[PDB]
Amino acid sequence: MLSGLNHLTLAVSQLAPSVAFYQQLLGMTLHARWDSGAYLSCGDLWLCLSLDPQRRVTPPEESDYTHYAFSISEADFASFAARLEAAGVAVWKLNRSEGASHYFLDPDGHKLELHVGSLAQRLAACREQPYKGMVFF
Template identity: 55%
Template sequence: MLNGLNHITIAVNDVSRSFTFYSKTLGFTPKARWSRGAYLFLGNLWLCLSADSVDTREDYTHYAFSIRSEDFDEFVNHLKSSGVTEWKTNQSEGKSFYFLDPDGHKLEVHVGDLNSRLNACIQHPYENMQFF
């Protein structure tokens, strides 16, 4: 039986550039690095950067990171001053900022969790939404 998310691996064009972005800009803790990849850690998330040809898609797939409400504005200002590209404007519950990493991977910082999202959806459900 599955018991949780193990790790996320993302393809990167330049390991050094992405390593710097994820460790210095986003605050991941470096754990290991080699010529074609790196392992980083954030909270309980194990992130692997893997040198490969990157093919970003035009869908809504993205990776969201949690942030405390009191840290949100300062961190978003930090991201903007670092030159990140915003790819979407938030239209859902909770504060969110959607931005791209150096390879165009879609990322988000979000205040809230599944419970706060479900509570908002109870008040304003999506089309044909069912709760379990």
């Protein structure tokens, strides 16, 4: 059967600024780069940045809610979010509708998130503060 996410590939409009964002600003590990892409890891996540002439820099009001959240510990969350803010990283959402999260944009407007907590923890929180109509299986 399917066993998890093998990789996440993000189309990027300018490779070097995107590599810098994920490696330098977010601290991911850069393994290789070439004229049209890069491979990074974030823990077990395999991230591929793919240079795509079709990628547009997209304001958050023009894109849907599809987004990519990265795990961070409770001890590191606030200072990492504050560092992104001080670095001028654009945002896209303020209301914490799914727990302790910071919502920010990559250089092309990909919707990213820092989140503290697992699915199990989110389900437990939702049992007390459920979303409208919520059913648990």
